[PDB]
Protein backbone atom coordinates (compact mmCIF):
# COMPACT_ATOMS: atom_id res chain seq x y z
CA UNK A 1 0.00 0.00 0.00
CA UNK A 2 2.96 2.33 -0.54
CA UNK A 3 3.59 4.69 -3.40
CA UNK A 4 7.28 5.47 -3.78
CA UNK A 5 9.03 8.06 -5.92
CA UNK A 6 12.60 9.13 -6.47
CA UNK A 7 13.64 12.65 -7.35
CA UNK A 8 16.13 15.53 -7.08
CA UNK A 9 15.32 19.16 -6.56
CA UNK A 10 16.82 22.36 -5.31
CA UNK A 11 16.97 22.49 -1.53
CA UNK A 12 18.63 25.85 -0.80
CA UNK A 13 20.93 28.59 -2.11
CA UNK A 14 24.39 29.25 -0.65
CA UNK A 15 26.34 32.41 0.13
CA UNK A 16 29.93 32.83 1.38
CA UNK A 17 31.12 35.42 3.90
CA UNK A 18 34.21 36.83 5.73
CA UNK A 19 33.07 35.13 8.96
CA UNK A 20 31.80 31.65 9.77
CA UNK A 21 28.07 31.07 9.48
CA UNK A 22 26.24 28.00 10.66
CA UNK A 23 22.69 27.21 9.51
CA UNK A 24 20.63 24.03 9.52
CA UNK A 25 17.74 22.38 7.68
CA UNK A 26 15.50 19.53 8.76
CA UNK A 27 15.56 16.32 6.79
CA UNK A 28 11.79 16.10 6.54
CA UNK A 29 9.83 16.30 3.25
CA UNK A 30 8.34 19.68 3.91
CA UNK A 31 11.76 21.32 4.18
CA UNK A 32 13.86 19.30 1.77
CA UNK A 33 12.38 21.23 -1.12
CA UNK A 34 9.25 22.68 -2.69
CA UNK A 35 8.39 19.87 -5.03
CA UNK A 36 8.52 17.06 -2.47
CA UNK A 37 6.96 19.29 0.17
CA UNK A 38 4.00 19.50 -2.17
CA UNK A 39 3.57 15.88 -3.19
CA UNK A 40 4.51 14.30 0.12
CA UNK A 41 1.81 16.32 1.86
CA UNK A 42 -0.81 14.13 0.23
CA UNK A 43 0.22 11.20 2.44
CA UNK A 44 0.02 11.07 6.25
CA UNK A 45 3.37 9.38 6.90
CA UNK A 46 6.52 8.51 4.97
CA UNK A 47 9.95 6.92 5.21
CA UNK A 48 13.32 7.82 3.81
CA UNK A 49 14.95 5.12 1.70
CA UNK A 50 17.71 7.43 0.57
CA UNK A 51 18.45 11.10 1.16
CA UNK A 52 21.39 12.96 -0.34
CA UNK A 53 22.38 16.58 -0.10
CA UNK A 54 24.68 17.70 -2.91
CA UNK A 55 26.45 21.05 -3.08
CA UNK A 56 27.05 22.56 -6.49
CA UNK A 57 28.98 25.77 -7.27
CA UNK A 58 27.86 28.72 -9.36
CA UNK A 59 30.81 31.01 -8.71
CA UNK A 60 34.25 31.14 -10.26
CA UNK A 61 37.60 29.42 -9.61
CA UNK A 62 38.52 32.88 -8.37
CA UNK A 63 36.04 33.27 -5.53
CA UNK A 64 37.37 32.13 -2.16
CA UNK A 65 35.30 30.29 0.38
CA UNK A 66 34.64 26.85 1.80
CA UNK A 67 31.44 24.98 2.62
CA UNK A 68 30.89 22.36 5.31
CA UNK A 69 28.10 19.91 5.93
CA UNK A 70 27.12 17.29 8.46
CA UNK A 71 24.22 15.54 10.12
CA UNK A 72 22.79 15.82 13.63
CA UNK A 73 20.05 13.63 15.05
CA UNK A 74 19.16 14.73 18.57
CA UNK A 75 17.78 18.13 17.62
CA UNK A 76 18.29 19.30 21.16
CA UNK A 77 22.01 18.96 20.49
CA UNK A 78 23.40 22.48 20.34
CA UNK A 79 24.18 23.15 16.71
CA UNK A 80 27.92 23.37 15.89
CA UNK A 81 29.65 26.75 15.80
CA UNK A 82 33.14 25.89 14.57
CA UNK A 83 34.34 24.09 11.46
CA UNK A 84 35.96 21.70 13.90
CA UNK A 85 32.79 20.73 15.76
CA UNK A 86 31.03 20.27 12.48
CA UNK A 87 33.82 18.08 11.14
CA UNK A 88 32.85 15.56 13.81
CA UNK A 89 29.23 14.80 12.82
CA UNK A 90 28.39 11.86 10.61
CA UNK A 91 29.03 12.29 6.92
CA UNK A 92 31.12 15.42 7.27
CA UNK A 93 32.30 16.88 4.02
CA UNK A 94 34.02 20.12 3.06
CA UNK A 95 35.42 21.86 0.02
CA UNK A 96 35.88 25.14 -1.83
CA UNK A 97 32.67 26.98 -2.70
CA UNK A 98 33.74 26.60 -6.33
CA UNK A 99 34.51 22.89 -6.12
CA UNK A 100 31.96 20.09 -6.29
CA UNK A 101 30.89 20.42 -9.90
CA UNK A 102 31.50 16.67 -9.99
CA UNK A 103 28.53 16.03 -7.76
CA UNK A 104 26.27 17.12 -10.57
CA UNK A 105 26.32 13.51 -11.68
CA UNK A 106 24.25 12.57 -8.60
CA UNK A 107 21.40 14.80 -9.54
CA UNK A 108 20.87 13.63 -13.11
CA UNK A 109 21.54 10.17 -11.65
CA UNK A 110 23.68 8.78 -14.50
CA UNK A 111 26.95 6.81 -14.77
CA UNK A 112 29.31 8.29 -12.19
CA UNK A 113 32.97 7.48 -11.70
CA UNK A 114 34.89 10.66 -10.81
CA UNK A 115 32.95 11.54 -7.67
CA UNK A 116 36.00 11.88 -5.41
CA UNK A 117 35.67 15.62 -5.60
CA UNK A 118 31.89 15.60 -5.02
CA UNK A 119 30.80 17.82 -2.13
CA UNK A 120 27.87 15.62 -1.27
CA UNK A 121 26.79 13.62 1.76
CA UNK A 122 24.18 10.99 2.46
CA UNK A 123 21.75 10.16 5.25
CA UNK A 124 22.01 6.76 6.95
CA UNK A 125 18.32 5.89 6.73
CA UNK A 126 19.12 2.62 8.55
CA UNK A 127 20.13 4.01 11.96
CA UNK A 128 17.25 6.51 12.09
CA UNK A 129 14.92 7.03 15.05
CA UNK A 130 12.02 5.00 13.64
CA UNK A 131 10.98 4.10 10.07
CA UNK A 132 7.70 5.84 9.57
CA UNK A 133 7.64 9.54 10.32
CA UNK A 134 4.60 11.83 10.13
CA UNK A 135 4.56 14.50 7.46
CA UNK A 136 5.02 17.77 9.25
CA UNK A 137 4.77 21.40 8.30
CA UNK A 138 7.62 23.74 9.26
CA UNK A 139 5.07 25.93 11.01
CA UNK A 140 3.54 23.16 13.14
CA UNK A 141 6.92 21.70 14.09
CA UNK A 142 8.08 25.17 15.00
CA UNK A 143 5.25 25.43 17.51
CA UNK A 144 5.95 22.05 19.07
CA UNK A 145 9.62 22.83 19.50
CA UNK A 146 8.51 26.11 21.04
CA UNK A 147 7.24 24.07 23.98
CA UNK A 148 10.22 21.78 24.11
CA UNK A 149 12.79 20.72 21.58
CA UNK A 150 12.79 17.07 22.58
CA UNK A 151 9.25 16.95 21.30
CA UNK A 152 10.91 16.93 17.89
CA UNK A 153 12.75 13.64 18.08
CA UNK A 154 9.52 11.87 17.19
CA UNK A 155 8.75 14.26 14.30
CA UNK A 156 12.01 14.34 12.34
CA UNK A 157 14.80 11.88 11.45
CA UNK A 158 17.63 14.41 11.47
CA UNK A 159 18.90 17.73 10.24
CA UNK A 160 21.68 18.84 7.94
CA UNK A 161 23.94 21.44 9.46
CA UNK A 162 25.86 23.73 7.13
CA UNK A 163 28.79 26.03 7.76
CA UNK A 164 30.24 28.61 5.37
CA UNK A 165 33.37 30.70 5.79
CA UNK A 166 36.76 31.72 4.44
CA UNK A 167 34.94 34.26 2.30
CA UNK A 168 36.39 36.98 0.11
CA UNK A 169 34.08 39.69 1.44
CA UNK A 170 32.17 40.33 4.65
CA UNK A 171 28.95 40.57 2.70
CA UNK A 172 27.25 37.61 0.99
CA UNK A 173 28.54 36.23 -2.32
CA UNK A 174 26.62 33.82 -4.53
CA UNK A 175 28.60 30.60 -4.04
CA UNK A 176 26.44 27.67 -5.04
CA UNK A 177 23.32 25.68 -4.18
CA UNK A 178 22.46 22.52 -2.31
CA UNK A 179 20.18 20.05 -4.02
CA UNK A 180 18.51 17.04 -2.47
CA UNK A 181 18.22 13.64 -4.07
CA UNK A 182 15.71 11.41 -2.34
CA UNK A 183 13.82 8.15 -2.59
CA UNK A 184 10.82 8.24 -0.32
CA UNK A 185 8.03 5.86 0.64
CA UNK A 186 4.72 7.59 1.31
CA UNK A 187 1.75 5.96 3.02
CA UNK A 188 -1.73 6.58 4.35
CA UNK A 189 -3.03 9.40 2.08
CA UNK A 190 -4.95 12.44 3.23
CA UNK A 191 -6.25 15.59 1.67
CA UNK A 192 -3.15 17.75 1.29
CA UNK A 193 -4.96 20.61 3.01
CA UNK A 194 -5.32 18.61 6.22
CA UNK A 195 -1.73 17.53 6.74
CA UNK A 196 0.16 19.29 9.51
- Point out the annotated binding site for Ca(2+): 74, 77, 135, 195-196
Question: From CA 14, how far away is CA 3, in angstroms rounded?
Answer: 32
Residues of this chain, 150-189, that bind a second copy according to CB under 8 A: 150-155, 165-168, 173-174, 176-177, 179, 187-189
Question: From CA 34, how far away is CA 190, in angstroms rounded?
Answer: 18
Distances (CA, A) of 130 to 1, 152, 154: 19, 13, 8
Residues of this chain, 131-150, that bind Ca ion according to CB under 5 A: 134-135
**Is 150 in a helix, a strand, or coil?**
helix
Minimal distance, residue 179 CB to a second copy, in Å:
6
Task: State the binding partner of 23 from a second copy, Ca ion, none, CB within 5 to 8 A by kind.
Answer: none
| CA Rg value for the chain | 17
Residue closest to 87 by CA, chosen among 67, 65, 64, 68:
68
What 8-state DSSP symbol labels residue 18?
S
Q: How far is CA 114 from the centre of its chain?
A: 23
Residues of this chain, 74-93, that bind Ca ion according to CB under 5 A: 74, 76-77
x/- track of binding to Ca ion for residues 50-79 (CB under 5 A): ------------------------x-xx--
Residues of this chain, 56-115, that bind a second copy according to CB under 8 A: 56-66, 71-80, 83-85, 87-96, 98-105, 107-108, 110-115
Contact call for residue 138 and a second copy (CB under 8 A): no
Binding site for Ca ion (CB under 5 A): 74, 76-77, 134-135, 195
Amino acid sequence: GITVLTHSELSAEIGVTDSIVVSSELVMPYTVGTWLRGVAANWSKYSWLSVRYTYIPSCPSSTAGSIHMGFQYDMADTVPVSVNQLSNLRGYVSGQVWSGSAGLCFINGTRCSDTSTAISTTLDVSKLGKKWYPYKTSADYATAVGVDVNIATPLVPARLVIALLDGSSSTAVAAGRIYCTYTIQMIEPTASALNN
